[PDB]
Symmetry: D2
């Protein structure tokens, strides 16, 4: 061949609009501290509220923080007079009418990826635990039985981990798994840049053939529904292990149960199930919830967990920071980036030295001529910069205008409030 070119590899201005924050479902303390440090008055609750007690409280509330339990429907959101934004201190947002919340000009924020590390660590733990049958050993000794067994108990070093879904969690797991001396194969429907010395594989069937531990880290889709069933378990190695901390639908439990009973699968660890209790309870996990529970809990070397993949102080702490920060930046700067129901819109902060500069936050219906109106109303002042984006029926305009005194604020606000397309207005000075 021939030697050829190697491959290419100022303190900010504090904006003013008391602010009322209501937090439900035991939001982490980190969230509470962030809000209080900004002056906001914070109401905290360890549990949800009934539809009655809530409506009375959401009348005056400027920002509500919820989790998965509190359902915010059109019914309960219509009484929200001053509500600026909703914080989902969790992954899910189904508990909120996004479409409606949008139409009233309420921005919703969540924490999708705060639990990645917590699920990865759990899987390392579960790999070692299954490999050595810790659960069984500890249960035996607790009932007074001494069963010292080395047969088909393994060092994880030199074993192969099959990661189905190389996302946020799958990729973090990859690094840890290599660190613990595992070979890492991964099947994904998308071609993804491997971390460390991991190897992407063309077919799930190849992964199942060559892996000792198979773990799922995929979302819920028709493709993932019962994607691990009799045929897949038949394609896996004799005495291999199945780990599902992904979704309750992705594994066919009765197939797994047969495979385990047939001495084909040496053990498994499930964090998620097709049907799960709505609350913590004593007789919650039974044949009424899942027909096969009593059969499943009969099997040896099966680790069962009540959806604790992201159940850590770290996870809840960073969820508290991520979301509390998101709401704070939306309230203080109108920053709607990362919003799940809103146009994503932001502008560089203003310097302290930019005296007499107001920020216009104008959520409006996405129809022609609205900017014509607004920029006419602001024509008397120089627009340093502005940004407008649309999300279906709704749209959001941020504009920084210079040379406004206390006098002209009241005027500009009133004029914008009287506009045809207006859904909500805030002025930050």
């Amino acid at each position: 061949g021939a030697v050829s070119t190697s491959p290419t590899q100022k303190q900010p201005k504090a904006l003013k609009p008391d602010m009322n924050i209501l937090l439900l479902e035991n939001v982490n303390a980190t969230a509470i501290k962030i809000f209080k440090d900004q002056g906001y008055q914070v109401e905290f609750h360890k549990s949800s509220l009934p539809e009655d007690e809530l409506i009375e409280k959401i009348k005056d509330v400027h920002a509500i923080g919820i989790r998965s339990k509190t359902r915010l429907t059109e019914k309960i959101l219509q009484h929200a007079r001053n509500l600026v934004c909703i914080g989902c201190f969790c992954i899910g947002t189904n508990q909120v009418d996004l479409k409606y919340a949008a139409s009233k000009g309420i921005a919703v924020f969540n924490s999708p990826f705060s639990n990645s590390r917590s699920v990865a660590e759990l899987v390392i733990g579960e790999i070692i635990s299954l490999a050595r049958q810790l659960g069984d050993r500890s249960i035996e000794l607790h009932t007074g039985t001494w069963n010292k067994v080395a047969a088909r108990c393994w060092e994880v070093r030199g074993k192969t981990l099959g990661i189905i879904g190389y996302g946020h969690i799958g990729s973090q797991l990859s690094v840890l798994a290599e660190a613990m001396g595992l070979h890492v194969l991964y099947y994904d429907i998308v071609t993804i840049m491997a971390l460390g010395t991991a190897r992407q594989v063309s077919t799930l069937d190849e992964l199942l053939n060559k892996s000792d531990f198979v773990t799922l880290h995929v979302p819920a889709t028709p493709e993932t529904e019962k994607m691990l069933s009799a045929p897949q378990f038949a394609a896996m190695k004799d005495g291999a292990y199945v780990i599902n901390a992904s979704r309750g639908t992705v594994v066919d439990i009765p197939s797994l149960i047969q495979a385990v009973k047939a001495n084909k699968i040496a053990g498994a660890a499930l964090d998620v199930y097709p049907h799960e209790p709505a609350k913590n309870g004593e007789g919650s996990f039974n044949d009424e919830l899942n027909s096969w529970t009593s059969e499943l809990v009969s099997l040896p070397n099966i680790i069962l967990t009540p959806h604790i993949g992201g159940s850590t102080e770290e996870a809840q702490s960073s969820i508290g920071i991520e979301v509390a920060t998101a709401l704070s930046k939306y309230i203080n700067e109108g920053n709607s980036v990362g919003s799940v129901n809103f146009p994503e819109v932001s502008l560089k902060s203003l310097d302290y030295d930019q005296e007499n500069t107001v920020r216009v936050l104008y959520i409006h219906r996405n129809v022609p001529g609205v900017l014509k109106t607004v920029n006419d109303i602001l024509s008397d002042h120089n627009i340093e910069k502005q940004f407008s984006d649309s999300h279906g029926e709704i749209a959001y305009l941020m504009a920084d205008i210079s040379s406004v005194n206390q006098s002209e604020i009241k005027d500009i606000y009133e004029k914008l409030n009287q506009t045809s397309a207006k859904v909500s207005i805030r002025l930050l000075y």
Copy 2:
């Protein structure tokens, strides 16, 4: 001024190579025929393969033998492989006519009368460090398990209870692991623990070069103050006996974790039990106890064995394991290789290096082209004039090289002598066998 850098203390690397060595001479025993290996207590298959490939006739057993059936078998046996259960006392070893060496396919050797075995010229070998990785992995698993209360969660769901709890459940990342004893296991654990994102403090009675970004601490009390997880990897000594007790638990953080896969004596269980009940210790994992069953059994772990068992098993987030730290196919496999190899090299080359009861003695192999060269293996009483006698008896032949070392009352001489034909072997053997100091002789030709 710009000066010579300090010379690298001992920071040189070893690129392992297929080393073109002059093919070595395969030595065979004299004055004997076929070799008899007896293996008890279900020694790994790797050991069996190694022995058969040497020509040895192998007798295998999944269990021990009674003192009766054993004495009958050890009469003819050239090498015995045992584990912890089979006790080889003066009583049963005195009947051992042909016994060359004992293999302890395990850490412990207490099950063997070493002093006596020595006096009869029997070399004992074991596998002290074959289980390091297996114990290290277990501890990573147990750290995560306790951190998240997996055991409890899985037990709840099995009894039908759904208890999703994040309160005082932790990511191990950013937490501190306190390693008491930075030996073979402690140091392997250090690397894994950093990989899992843990800070690693370690207290040891000896100053030790840290691996990765681990930090040695002056006092145990410092480690206990600053650690989230405390794990012991120390031998059994009067200094380690109940070294973690009420005062130590009192020095540890609120909601800290105690892991003992070291020795059954090193933790004061009733202090731990108090500490756990006092909400001081959030969880613990024990693999070892002051008293343990001798056999697997369903009623074995009870108040008769340890007064506090029924109280201990009453506590939440306590992982209990029946001494499985090294209970893996890998561990047993490499134990089989390490020890089987050790016995093979002792039987075939007289190599006694790594022996626990013997002088450690070896010589470089002989080349294939060194025809008519015999290796004299002469275990003898460690008294003056013995070498005078032996080297007199060999005087007719050139001694290429010899090595003699002493271990108290007993001593071992290896000697390579050149220009010996079948005729002179029988003579040299007989003369050496009739010597005053002789305890045992073998000639390899």
Copy 3:
């Protein structure tokens, strides 16, 4: 004693066309740039050298985008004849060769490649450290003149030696990693407190660095503070037989002080890539006493490596400069993306899907005065504005707007109306 606590928080798009494109490339811009432009259909004129102000003005009349380097000077004089010029590409760090203020006022966005050369300068310094440490230059020169001088005296392994990095920027920090990899201790002085990479240690005073370092290398910009910052007093503060490496700026080292220090056996060697005065062209006898009074004295000294500003002179560097800038121009021309521009408001919008038929992108550079958006948004009122962004850079400002439901008919109209506006500086419509 304490409590177990929560750990600390962790440390197809639519191809838009203007409603032939002419690229002029001067000063031997890398081929990567040429290929990027041609693949987009643009007609490319290439030249290995600059043009004279006469031949240039004739060519820049029709040119849509010009790519230059440091030599070609684009003044008000030559830019005023630029009829169709959309953007300027500086395929190099410097932009002083361009009247930015003027280029801005005509609505011309200027782009450059500031950090494309980091790796190339870092590698050079590793090379020069080892070379000075062992006196390679001297040894090879001796043997070439027939002299055999096998010398180990005050020749060093770099392992266990200390590198003093003055200025811990893009280059300083890349150098830090390599230097540790080669077994060097890394001290660094900076005027700002900066997070160390690997196991490097920041030092409070330059004086401390100079006291404790074996090799001193500068990676600082040109400022009044850096001007001759290494002089007699600094060399006096350095270790006996220490080494000075300057691939930063020509002004930052006092050459005559260095020369005295070297002659006084205080500095064992040095490597300079940059000088107060440098030739404008490659030539024989270009580097002489006419250019720098001390050259003939400097080139008289042993263990001094001199290089003609080659810090970033590698196929890699030129290649990635070609990609970075050609890409920048392409995205500005094709999408109006002005992010990373040195003279312009930084403005961009997410690309439009292939499925977004009948959507036009309005690129409206205008004077930064009140009422302009009022006018523009009035003129566009007949169509829904999906999204728009306007930012200002002093006297000038830039508005990007995506409008939906426009047929060939209405484009011509909207263009004309916007072109007739009071504040207009330049308009393009992407359809």
Copy 4:
């Protein structure tokens, strides 16, 4: 069942050594020890010897055969380098000489066979220069890659030639290491650190360091490498192993680096390849013929026919065999060898000796009072141990080791319960033995 989960394939940090402080053994007779050091042995060696009480004579240069013979009469240990030739002629006058230290790689300057027959153990430092050669090559790779030498030479003659054409970042380039030994392997790590891919051809299969890949044929390495560097010994197989056919197998604009041996590269082939624009540059530290002393006009057509043609070429780095020419290298050579001699003199430890049986014994504790160490070099003939072990029969031999090296052999023995009285006796008896070549007693 595609397969089954099976046993994974079967595969301590440094600690303050808690051993019973060892007994410092002193020679019987040898009242004061005489060390002679020639050819400017590093100061580290001098310090080691003086700190042990030895009287040290130092010289920056060699001695003439006359001045030397007069000095080697009384000398207990001599330290030399490559220049001082120790022949049968000059060694026969050596009355008290215990050991020779070669503070360098080569030992050809010493009659080993003869030195052996007189019972003189010779030691050297074979691998003390590994790091220094590895660093040089990294430097030379970057220098060739960027043409530093040329650039600096141009500017010195007043020429400003700013060139990026066929000048490279080393990152993403391939280094071909011919010979993955001590130097080759250290170079591998550094080269990866500098972002280079590392192929290596060796005649022996060797465990790769980092992410380096061993290659089956030299021809493969030459095809795929951007920089080729040799780190091989001098053998008939290596003689002119890189010639026209090899350069023809290399990439257009590739680079050749030889800091191995002067015989391994065919210079006139390289010169043609360079002139044919096939090789973009090269760096040679070694040549078929080299001056014996530093001098002006030493490197000329009289020494190598092609010099004047070679020095005419662009981007060729030439060095006068400086691969190991660093203060570090000389320092660690001084330590390695001085230590070796000290341990041989103090403990009879002959491990690492080039002409001797390699023999050693664990040190004796301070608590082992009245234990003498017998060092008995003797002719390798039957009945010698019979004699020695007879002579020592009155005492318990704790341990002894005897090994043979052709005609000569070496016995170390630790004997217990000897008082000053019995030492003089045992020494005399052993000195009068038929096979004796030399005896020392350490108490």
